[PDB]
Amino acid sequence: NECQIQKLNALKPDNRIESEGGLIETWNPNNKPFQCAGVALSRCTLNRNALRRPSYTNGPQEIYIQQGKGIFGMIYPGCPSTRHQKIYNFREGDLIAVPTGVAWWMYNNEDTPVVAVSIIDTNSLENQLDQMPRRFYLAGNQEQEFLKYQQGGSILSGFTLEFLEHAFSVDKQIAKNLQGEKGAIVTVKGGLSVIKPICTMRLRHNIGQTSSPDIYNPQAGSVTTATSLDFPALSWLRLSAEFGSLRKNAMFVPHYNLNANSIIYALNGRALIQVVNCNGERVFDGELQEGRVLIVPQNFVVAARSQSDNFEYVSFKTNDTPMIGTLAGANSLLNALPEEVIQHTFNLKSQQARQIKNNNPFKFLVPPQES
Amino acid sequence: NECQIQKLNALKPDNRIESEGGLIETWNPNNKPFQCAGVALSRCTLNRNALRRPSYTNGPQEIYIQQGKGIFGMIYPGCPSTRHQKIYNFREGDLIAVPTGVAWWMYNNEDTPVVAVSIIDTNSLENQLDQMPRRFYLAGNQEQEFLKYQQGGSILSGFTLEFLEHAFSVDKQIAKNLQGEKGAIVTVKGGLSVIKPICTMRLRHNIGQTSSPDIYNPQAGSVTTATSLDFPALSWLRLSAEFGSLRKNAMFVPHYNLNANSIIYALNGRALIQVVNCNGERVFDGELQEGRVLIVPQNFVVAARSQSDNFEYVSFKTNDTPMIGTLAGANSLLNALPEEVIQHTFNLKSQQARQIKNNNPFKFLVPPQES
Amino acid sequence: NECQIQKLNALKPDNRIESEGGLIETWNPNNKPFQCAGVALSRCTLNRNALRRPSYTNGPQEIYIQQGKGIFGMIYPGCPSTRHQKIYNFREGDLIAVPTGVAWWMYNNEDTPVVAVSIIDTNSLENQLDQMPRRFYLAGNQEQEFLKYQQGGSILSGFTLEFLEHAFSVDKQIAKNLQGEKGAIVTVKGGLSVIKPICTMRLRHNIGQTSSPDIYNPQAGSVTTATSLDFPALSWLRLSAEFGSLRKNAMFVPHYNLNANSIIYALNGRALIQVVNCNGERVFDGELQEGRVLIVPQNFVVAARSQSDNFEYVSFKTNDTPMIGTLAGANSLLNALPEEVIQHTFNLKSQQARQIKNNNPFKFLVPPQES
């Protein structure tokens, strides 16, 4: 049973690939948390003047930009150019959606490096190969990030020198340059001079600190969710994301996701999280701090208290329109029960039954206890 | 190969979990018939004043009510209250729809117990965990029905006292009660005074005690089906159900389900069934009695001859719009054939071929042979 | 890991069944390429006056007629008769769409034997049984093509005489005839007197040389593809196909399917094919010749150079709207990339980057190298 998790742990990467203009880190997809989850996590960071060479995966991918600014371009097959296809800019808090098998390249021009953390849902209907994550690079000899877990060069360097020569219609010499002969993130010495501004579908939506949050409480913090309702290209991925920023000691109530798996990646600070399963067992009772990830499976209950000012996280849910069941708060599940059945399922009295329903008037985030 | 079954048998429950005001019976979901099917059956009977405590599952659920009258309520996350959300009434014959993760509760008030037989489609696309059935109870300390198969407390009892005090904003004492400290089906001493009557979606459709049978033969019986067509909440589940009443010795023609898995549970009487596979092997040739279940895989063919007045059954099919291919009778696949191809594939004469296409005028149900 | 394929090979069939009026060949569905592709391939052949007795399967099928002419009939459950349901005539180059579970019969009257190569998508969502291919014949005592791999009689010959009797309302004499008491393909001595002209939807479309192609280069050849845009019954199958003819020494560029697996069947001639994976390994390099099959996974990259006048193939894609990403061509992925980024990923000088974007001005198909 892939999802019979005994104990979850704040996971951190087990693979660092240092490249010329950056670095790529990946989390093991063969751990029972990720196997249960159905995702492959990774965190790519590009420095000044670095370009992440074009590549593609066989699954839905969702990229969240932790820090920095740059530009990115998709190479969508049935689309028109301009010379070249469309290029979008991006900032911190941007959620980029990458449809199955589509190729892209990303570039950074500032001193502040781009830190992009992403997920490939390898258990998608669209992924027709097997659960193993894999990336297909267009150019350059270097082994793909997920090769380590399988057990190189790019797709073009694998052909025969005469087949490139024949296909592209060029000579032996530039056919050798194309045929492989630095890694995925190379440094564009002077800098890519390319202008800074489904084919017309927007694949960039901002959920980070620069938005109009869904839930806002000036004493507890705020939450901003991006479903396919507000970012229509997400329905093409069947993926979502959530950004939260909690004030020290404020907490998000116990809640479960009715239809999605969550992968909570901590952006800043630290938190005391608690998650419990179908058998009442508390499968995690600890701290999740910056750069670590906690996986909460489908109907498991989650609650967190902030130990920082502020504790920020990104939550990749595996459903483009995730529904969450709240267990405490203005709109809780207990709030919708008859007071009388609340009395008989929890063994309380009518008065106490009123207290569970009405003592906490806040939706999802609750302020510091004020002690 | 889960469905490469050699011999089907009428299955019984292997788990009884007596509770204060009721009982819970569950069939083993690891026997190959059920692995092939992708469901998990369960029969919950609730005596007078029994309140089944709030719970939810990680998969679509469909409840047929074999006997009794009660009230049931679903706590749907995005929904408006009235105090509390909607309370629906039910009668024997009703089909209750339960979308993945939605929490519900049930109550009975009359002497005649409620017996509700139900299936959880663990093989659903909305089941992002594993093929293990699981119930997540919002209250009470008790081992959930399926824990036996896996190898307790509620989801709220797994949390630290400090966390529940904060989340609900209540004192230690009431927080202690909420945190556990009679099993799933409890008894309400005085009885609930709660008013006997998507957030709009009708999720109750009567298929047993109706008067609008899909097919009706006064000399053979009747059969009713409830598809999404007439019960739209069912497209949320991708599940269906059929109710049939068969007179002694009457029969339902050899047939198959093109796009679904049937789980036939006998509600009354007995009947002689025959089910044959792609190889011509008779994988089951015996009788199916009250309270027993026979699984007929996807394109396997089934035929039944009644042995009681009447043999009633509910067949849960795994598709909200199942399609059956009747092999004998008014709209049989052989009727739609050319008279000449039926002659050459069956090796019959022109005259005989006419009899197979017209001797039985009846649709699905065929009257007793008259001996 | 099913699709973690090392070396591919042009596969030829392992099973063969000489029927009265024909022959049936089937490829082993438990080979790793087919295990990975999720399909079963079979080549049936009807000689003159041959009839294929009605049968069905647990999954979408897509038949392509290599050669010959004849008529076929599909027995759809709720469809109206005319005496019998509607008949359609087929010609070579036709692609017939058969829904999951639907039954169909096939007849050939010219001397010229019909050769039809088809696939069953066992990995479908419609397939609720297991990864085994299995045909369910309505008549005749013979063993189902695929039994061999699983390790007979039809679905009627398994039933008891008195059940069949009561079912069709007949006499033990024809009931016995009916109960099974010449294989799947049976020759009709005089030959059917049947004419030669969802219930109305078109389930036949020609993708043969006769049709207007999607690509036609007078020097390279031509390509025709049938999606659900131009043949909507395929949106039910979630399958599609592609016919291609290639002049000697011409070639189709290196490309990959973004959203589908492909099963290349060599109709005529021989070619030299190469396919490389995500690591950069040419997992195949040799020649796919007539009557052989090459499975090319999802994002794997293929390239073929014709060795005949002309190499003709049928590519079975597992998606009704397959998106292809061409790597060299007028339309190519590199063409959308800025000149400067194709400079930096491929270590090229500007003028060399322009040469890749423009030397080859053709879509998909490139003429012979001109030697």
From Swiss-Prot, chains A, B, C:
Q: How is it modified after translation?
A: During soybean germination, seed storage proteins are hydrolyzed by protease/26S proteasome. The precursor is post-translationally processed to form a covalently linked A1a-Bx subunit complex.
Q: Which cysteines are joined by disulfide bonds?
A: C3-C36, C79-C199
> Any keyword Zinc-finger?
no
- The Cupin type-1 domain sits at 8-176, 205-354
What is any Pfam family matched here? Cupin_1
Q: Which UniProt keywords apply?
A: Allergen, Disulfide bond, Endoplasmic reticulum, Seed storage protein, Signal, Storage protein, Vacuole
GO cellular component terms? endoplasmic reticulum; protein storage vacuole
Q: Which CDD domains match?
A: cupin_11S_legumin_C, cupin_11S_legumin_N
**Application in biotechnology:** Emulsification efficiency of glycinin is improved by degree-dependent glycation with soy soluble polysaccharide (SSPS) at 60 degrees Celsius in both the acidic (A) and basic (B) polypeptides as a result of subunit dissociation at the quaternary level. Thermal treatment of soybean seed proteins leads to the aggregation of glycinin acidic and basic polypeptides (GAP and GBP, respectively). GBP improve sensory properties of meat (e.g. pork) during chilled storage and inhibit bacterial growth (e.g. L.monocytogenes, B.subtilis, E.coli and S.enteritidis).
Q: Where in the cell is it found?
A: Endoplasmic reticulum; Protein storage vacuole
Main localization, broad class? endoplasmic reticulum
Its domain of life reads Eukaryota
Tissues/organs with expression: Exclusively in seeds during embryogenesis.
Gene Ontology MF annotations: nutrient reservoir activity
Q: Subunit comment for this entry?
A: Hexamer; each subunit is composed of an acidic and a basic chain derived from a single precursor and linked by a disulfide bond. Interacts with the vacuolar-sorting receptor VSR via its vacuolar targeting signal.
What family is this? Answer: Belongs to the 11S seed storage protein (globulins) family.
Function, as annotated: Glycinin is the major seed storage protein of soybean. Glycinin basic peptides (GBPs), and, to a lower extent, glycinin exhibit antibacterial activity against Gram-negative and Gram-positive bacteria (e.g. L.monocytogenes, B.subtilis, E.coli and S.enteritidis) by forming pores and aggregating in transmembranes, leading to membrane permeability and, eventually, cell death.
Entry protein name: Glycinin G1
- Organism of origin: Glycine max
